[PDB]
Design a protein around this motif. Structure first.
Motif, PDB file in Angstrom:
ATOM      1  N   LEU A  53       0.886  -1.106   0.153  1.00  0.00           N
ATOM      2  CA  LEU A  53      -0.093   0.110   0.106  1.00  0.00           C
ATOM      3  C   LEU A  53       0.869   1.193   0.092  1.00  0.00           C
ATOM      4  N   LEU A  54       1.849   1.401   0.865  1.00  0.00           N
ATOM      5  CA  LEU A  54       2.675   2.335   0.912  1.00  0.00           C
ATOM      6  C   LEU A  54       3.706   2.525  -0.337  1.00  0.00           C
ATOM      7  N   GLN A  55       4.242   1.403  -1.051  1.00  0.00           N
ATOM      8  CA  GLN A  55       4.917   1.376  -2.246  1.00  0.00           C
ATOM      9  C   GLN A  55       4.174   2.146  -3.419  1.00  0.00           C
ATOM     10  N   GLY A  56       3.097   1.908  -3.546  1.00  0.00           N
ATOM     11  CA  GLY A  56       2.252   2.594  -4.431  1.00  0.00           C
ATOM     12  C   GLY A  56       1.918   3.956  -4.397  1.00  0.00           C
ATOM     13  N   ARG A  57       1.688   4.374  -2.927  1.00  0.00           N
ATOM     14  CA  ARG A  57       1.525   5.706  -2.853  1.00  0.00           C
ATOM     15  C   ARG A  57       2.542   6.526  -3.347  1.00  0.00           C
ATOM     16  N   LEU A  58       3.823   6.001  -3.139  1.00  0.00           N
ATOM     17  CA  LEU A  58       4.971   6.930  -3.418  1.00  0.00           C
ATOM     18  C   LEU A  58       4.715   7.373  -4.727  1.00  0.00           C
ATOM     19  N   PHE A  59       4.282   6.677  -5.730  1.00  0.00           N
ATOM     20  CA  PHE A  59       4.029   6.960  -7.037  1.00  0.00           C
ATOM     21  C   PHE A  59       2.907   8.058  -7.212  1.00  0.00           C
ATOM     22  N   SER A  60       1.680   7.740  -6.579  1.00  0.00           N
ATOM     23  CA  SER A  60       0.389   8.666  -6.802  1.00  0.00           C
ATOM     24  C   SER A  60       0.721   9.997  -6.281  1.00  0.00           C
ATOM     25  N   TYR A  61       1.108  10.464  -5.312  1.00  0.00           N
ATOM     26  CA  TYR A  61       1.340  11.750  -4.940  1.00  0.00           C
ATOM     27  C   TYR A  61       2.159  12.454  -5.649  1.00  0.00           C
ATOM     28  N   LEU A  62       3.137  12.074  -6.205  1.00  0.00           N
ATOM     29  CA  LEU A  62       3.996  12.651  -7.247  1.00  0.00           C
ATOM     30  C   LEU A  62       2.960  13.325  -8.466  1.00  0.00           C
ATOM     31  N   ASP A  63       2.796  12.014  -8.981  1.00  0.00           N
ATOM     32  CA  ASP A  63       1.916  12.078 -10.391  1.00  0.00           C
ATOM     33  C   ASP A  63       0.593  13.115 -10.012  1.00  0.00           C
ATOM     34  N   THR A  64      -0.170  12.765  -8.837  1.00  0.00           N
ATOM     35  CA  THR A  64      -1.478  13.685  -8.881  1.00  0.00           C
ATOM     36  C   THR A  64      -1.187  15.182  -8.790  1.00  0.00           C
TER      37      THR A  64
END
Ligand code: HEM
Ligand code: HEM
Ligand SMILES: [Ca+2]
Ligand SMILES: [Ca+2]
Ligand SMILES: [Ca+2]
Ligand SMILES: [Ca+2]
Ligand SMILES: [Ca+2]
Ligand SMILES: [Ca+2]
Lengths: 679, 677, 359
Positions: free
Chosen positions: B341-352
């Motif tokens: 769950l943490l691993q994927g968040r790292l992608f999401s917040y830079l992108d969004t």
């Protein structure tokens, strides 16, 4: 072949794919080992989360909260004698429509039942191009010049240090603007009436607000006002009901509309115009270019042009409702603008703001925005270009594409043309016409035209809102402006806030009235189909469920939406007391078999203390038809402290007599004798 | 003042364009006094273009929220457990910004929805911005970030009609919960009082994930973040929250804003559980699994320092709306774990932030800027504010003497991955079987609530599931609830006219843990900021005198006093017309106003029965209520409130009334007023 | 179509997988992200050029510029309310993409380079060894041109240090142009190995001369020059060559004026001998720059192209106005048929490399 049919995507079958058709999974990340870190090469993960990351678009700058439906417009006649407009050129001619209804001030997610102005935007997908009428449920606007719109909207939207509050009409900045900009009085009075809290999108009218022109093929023009007149009749909430409903069901208006369409009760309006001569622009005691003024129906009657019916819900709310992009610039041959400085500036705003929402210039290519006729123009490229243009010479004049596309005008290709009688003369000025300067007569006309209890509701709405203004200076300034409309209003409002009203100033006072603006005075509803009946029953007495099942048959016959409420769900029970509220109903019926639930000492772990009685008492206090059906009916009305001889109170042993009386109460809709008046 | 360098003052001066040309903005330029508007009116078009473009996309989740500036103070030198510079000295201060939120609602939705809540903290550290992007519930619905759109689509309104905005009260949400049993733990938290906190100040913050602390010597420990409220834990009751969602959609942002302005800036102890790398699978679950807590009995909280919020924003849009948090905002001394769950968040917040900001320079927004120098070869992009002097922005270079220099474990205080971290095995899209127990911890949580608390959670489930139209979804829900507790399944089932399935005791147990109960966390440690409504009348000078006397003695102890009467004057804050019980934590009637409480009372100045409704609602929602002055039985009898009731006060003496009443406000809720199954 | 086409290595299908090439690995992120920049929104796969030719079944939704109207109102997995559709695709169902099952990872999480990547010079030298002598000179010449425009003496020294590790001979020959000494040889990575298929000059004649461009330099002076140009055009166009007839002015059968013509426009240049007068010092005219006709011929010869004079009169300060009649890729025939048969061999040879000086 409609752009919406071609773009429908069916996912009722099939294996999951990427956006480029590669079958994939989307439930577990790709990892270096079973307890390992996620890999950058997981394209399934990134494509899915990128899409999610980018789902949102900017909400509309105003009217962010709203809901849409599809339908049809049908012309009643050939209107060639007054307009060239093709959608009006034959008896029975049908044009598809999309309508979006809205509030104005609140963000996405704000409750439907805020006190606010409401939007009523209609797109006609005509055979000569999309025509939008971007209207409101109130026929007049706050301001006389479009350049003031950010000042108005910044003043009513939440204070910008803390984004508080979401109550458009209940904070200092709003009343500061209203008191400093007296043009605001007419719309302010409408917004403080029951028109600020309509019962549904179906129970309000639509108005173009501005004077427009009808232009004939011969080039002659008349001045018109658009009126969409509801076939469901007019109705409001009461404020104390609206406040609870905002919490219990923030989606009440969007749900009301959705359900009415699903049940085959698609709402209807007569699309109407007042038509007057160009020579009458200044004949009615005000300027027809001034959008703070109505033409009283006694001076210019409504002509019925056609029927608007909404009869189909969207497939995807985002794709259709959220993405629909209205423009008063969406005009067709036979309609023209006026020099209303509010309308004039609107034309700029709606083309520009779609760049914000869509993030690119090709917003007219979204299926909901597409026309239903060929597009022939030299517009090219831009982000999100969905067309492949065959014409490699997109300039005029050309020989290399044989001069196509051809210019359209009054004499070619059914071109739009500006009304050829229109002229301009004088200095290039940033000055207001002195003809716009009477800010108080029409607010007074409107106030005079409401019934006494309706005047009380408006005074109470102002007492509520102005009492929440912290600035003593702003409150004083408000009473100064209210006093110009009505000394009586300024006195009664000043009483609630402990200030002295200014002395009467009779400059703009008058006793004139106009038909058609009163809700209270607009008589019983012409139909009770869709109206909501709560039947408060119980699982403890099998007599109570039989009483409920018999009321249900008799009420569902007449198209009423019946909710049987009990402690717990079972066959024939729709809702628990726990989820039930009087805001969910237009009338409330207690089956006498449930009398024990209304006892002061009634308690259950299945619903909050006093819930059954609270529903009945709330419904009574909010003016609704309420009754007990069964025989010990007199018994139960005492628990409620609800007087059995009350107007809109029903007490029958017979089911058939109970319903026959109760259905008349639903048409009456509100019993206004239950509301105290100032002396 | 930490963003003072960006502030624009408009208290003086003439209106200008954005390029400093003095202009007007009140009348369009027209061809004659009743003429059309000219295209050459730049004053009109520049003002309306700005207005037209004011809005930015709302956050994909947590769209509804509010923020405040504050300070973090370290209690110690934490070198012995982490290299983190903001924790490296006793009393070391670091500016912070926090945003609180709900999850599901759009940016205009009521604060007092039933929902998960966000608690996002930025530390503007002397070694870069560090963000802890947390929630008020310590466990998440899902075990893998790839599932987040499935969760959020299912809880958000149905996409054909965008109905309803009740996150936990429609078929699609309960379909997901029942088919994805990982959801059970967070679901039980959301159905408790933690789903309707009394305020942002009265809830905790949790990092949810296991992270690492990494020392300068490279050794690491596993940690959980716990921000422990110094205001104490408190909930609304549902019946209250629903009314408050209509009467005051802004209730939580107003409570926070008011607390800071009154000098009652909320405080949290910033704490960690610390455990060894060797304990990853030692507590009967996997520390990589974000659906699990470490019971405090297994690993106690270490207090690292104080978080105090004490300054409101100047511009909400520029500061709160534009703050762009990222778990990727990490500093030396902290590292990630293989929590999927943490691993994927790292992608999401830079992108969004590309979506929200419309361009790549979102870190240049005042609220996003760090408080230390930036040295890198990032360049250009839409909205570039910087003018870079270095004309050789590549590594390796000689033409800029090899600057900037590479920072790592051994040079320039570089971030570094915990050097003990390894991976081993197949490249797999497989779930660890160590993640497979979805029901024991939900049962732990349920077991750890008081009987009335357990009733409230059952009632929240009865409310929500009774609104699900699908009979097949309601059955699937009872199948999952039944694996946590047969008793919960039977009690919920009773509300919806279904049989619960037979007991399945695979995951049933009687273990309990401290610190998760709200009702059980005892009286509040302070009543400062709590709201006392005093119901009076203008019709009796002595009613106003009683109210002024009560005000003086209540304000002395830092309570927020509202005197209510028919109309405003000196000493009356609100009219009955605008007043509601959702507005108060306790209600006092002055006995001079008893006439307002008669069934006969009527006024054009307020709705029929409003004075008594405020009293009855307050009583029914469990609040301390009473009558000051000695003549109590007319009010109490009209309200059907017993004089001997717990949290029901009747004293002649203002002093004795307030001493009793203030004990009631500390107790906060009188739970004996709620029926049990 | 061309500007909006948005390529991605992440556009992969079942039967293909990635490797742990750290250049490839990071590309997968870049091309999905950069399309947000170009398209300004997340729906770039809906642009016609980017759309697939098979159905799309997924729970992606909304975003700026959303063109689809999705019927499925339950776009989450797992669902019952849409009957569990769309279904998961993987190795064993729905022809899903799947990662190569043999793939593994083992070791520390590291920001370190594999020492197996450290030889930067052997393969450059392999490539350089595999070029023909004139081709090696061209490469030396490209480096002399480029490095001579570098202002920093330090950067120029660092460049000779790296080139020297590939080939001392390259470092010496480039050093000569830029006024620097090559560092002493360093033979760590020197070798004499060669590989097939990397040389252009060595890849032999072209397999087809269709589309190659023949400029015929004629004149409006002489109706016989236009007749020569017309017969040459017919015979060249028969074999699929693209013929341009050049003259002072346009007319029937003339494609381009000397004013617009340049040797860069042709793979081969033929002068019809009827136009010999234009190829002399005399050659001034307001219709083209001084010397233009002869410059096209001289440029074409200097750049290695097949060149010739058709009609039988070739010397007439025509060739003598510059180049040798015995030259490889220099043609002189009266017969149009013989001329074209010789010339087409020259177009297939394409470049006459004996015209470039060697070190
Ligand atoms: C008679 C006065 C007006 C009426 C009746 C009116 C009506 C409306 C309506 C109904 C909408 C919502 C359409 C929808 O459902 O999507 C709307 C949106 C909007 N209006 Fe107006 N409006 C008025 C004046 C103005 C003025 C003076 C301006 C600006 C100068 C303005 C700017 C906007 C903008 C920016 C939006 C958002 C448009 C969009 O995002 O598509 N309006 N208005
Ligand atoms: C432990 C689980 C999670 C917690 C505690 C959490 C917390 C939060 C919070 C507090 C916010 C609001 C920040 C603010 O106030 O601006 C937020 C926003 C967001 N979260 Fe998460 N989240 C979690 C999981 C996820 C996952 C798994 C994803 C995606 C894979 C995700 C994607 C986002 C996105 C896209 C936003 C909007 C961010 C922004 O616009 O700046 N979250 N989250
Ligand atoms: Ca304000
Ligand atoms: Ca009304
Ligand atoms: Ca025209
Ligand atoms: Ca649903
Ligand atoms: Ca609780
Ligand atoms: Ca953009």
């Amino acid at each position: 072949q409609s752009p919406l049919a071609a773009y429908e995507v069916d996912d009722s079958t099939g294996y999951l794919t990427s956006d480029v058709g590669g079958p994939i999974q989307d439930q577990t990340s790709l990892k270096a080992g079973i307890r390992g870190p996620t890999l950058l090469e997981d394209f399934m993960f990134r494509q899915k989360i990128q899409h999610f990351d980018h789902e949102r678009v900017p909400e509309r700058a105003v009217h962010a909260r709203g809901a849409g439906a599809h339908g049809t417009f049908t012309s009643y006649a050939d209107w060639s004698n007054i307009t060239a407009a093709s959608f009006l050129n034959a008896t029975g001619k049908q044009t598809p429509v999309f309508v979006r209804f809205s509030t104005v001030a609140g963000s996405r997610g704000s409750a439907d039942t805020a006190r606010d102005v409401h939007g009523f935007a209609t797109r006609f997908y005509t055979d000569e191009g999309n025509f939008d009428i971007v209207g409101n449920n109130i026929p007049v606007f706050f301001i006389q010049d479009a350049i003031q719109f950010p000042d108005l909207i910044h003043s009513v939207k939440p204070r910008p240090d803390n984004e508080i509050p979401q109550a458009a009409t209940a904070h200092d900045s709003a009343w500061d603007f209203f008191s400093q900009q007296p043009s605001t009085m007419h719309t302010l009075f409408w917004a403080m009436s029951g028109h600020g809290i309509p019962r549904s999108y179906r129970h309000m009218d639509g108005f173009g607000v501005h004077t427009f022109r009808f232009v004939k093929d011969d080039g002659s023009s008349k001045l018109i006002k658009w009126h969409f007149k509801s076939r469901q009749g007019k109705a409001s909430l009461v404020w104390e009901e609206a406040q609870v409903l905002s919490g219990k069901n923030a989606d009440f208006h969007r749900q009301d509309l959705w359900d009415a369409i699903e049940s085959g009760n698609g709402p209807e309006w007569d699309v109407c115009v007042q038509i007057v001569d160009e020579s009458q622009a200044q004949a009615f005691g005000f300027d027809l270019l001034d959008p703070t003024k109505i033409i009283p129906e006694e001076y210019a009657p409504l002509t019925k042009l056609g029927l608007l019916k909404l009869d189909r819900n969207p497939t995807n709310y985002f794709a259709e409702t959220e993405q629909v992009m209205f423009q008063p610039g969406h005009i067709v041959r036979g309609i023209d603008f006026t020099e209303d400085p509010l309308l004039q500036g609107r034309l700029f705003s709606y083309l520009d703001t779609q760049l914000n929402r869509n993030g690119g210039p090709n917003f007219e290519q979204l299926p909901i925005n597409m026309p239903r006729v060929p597009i022939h123009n030299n517009n090219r490229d831009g982000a999100g270009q969905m067309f492949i243009h065959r014409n490699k010479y997109p300039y005029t004049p050309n020989t290399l594409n044989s001069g196509y596309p051809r210019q359209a005008n009054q004499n070619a290709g059914r071109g739009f043309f500006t009304a050829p009688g229109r002229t301009a003369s004088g200095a290039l000025v940033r000055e207001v016409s002195p003809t716009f300067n009477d800010h108080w007569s029409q607010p007074r006309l409107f106030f005079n035209s409401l019934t006494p209890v309706e005047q009380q509701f408006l005074v109470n709405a102002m007492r509520f809102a102005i009492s929440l203004v912290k600035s003593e200076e702003v409150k004083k300034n408000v009473l100064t402006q209210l006093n110009r409309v009505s000394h009586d209003v300024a006195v009664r409002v000043a009483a609630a806030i402990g200030l002295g009203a200014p002395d009467a100033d009779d400059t703009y006072y008058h006793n004139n009235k106009t038909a058609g603006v009163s809700i209270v005075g607009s008589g019983p509803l012409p139909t009770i189909k869709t109206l909501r009946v709560g039947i408060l029953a119980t699982t403890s007495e099998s007599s109570a469920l039989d009483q409920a099942a018999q009321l249900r048959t008799r009420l569902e016959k007449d198209g009423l939406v019946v909710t049987v409420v009990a402690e717990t769900l079972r066959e024939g029970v729709d809702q628990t007391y726990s989820t039930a509220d009087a805001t969910g109903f237009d009338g409330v019926v207690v089956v006498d078999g449930a009398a024990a639930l209304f006892a002061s000492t009634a308690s259950s772990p299945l619903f909050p203390t006093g819930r059954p009685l609270q529903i009945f008492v709330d419904a009574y206090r909010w003016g609704k038809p309420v009754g007990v059906c069964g025989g010990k009916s007199s018994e139960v009305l005492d628990a409620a402290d609800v007087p059995e001889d009350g107007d809109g109170v029903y007490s029958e042993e017979s089911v058939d007599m109970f319903v026959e009386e109760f259905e008349k109460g639903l048409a009456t809709f509100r019993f206004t004798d239950r509301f105290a008046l100032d002396s």
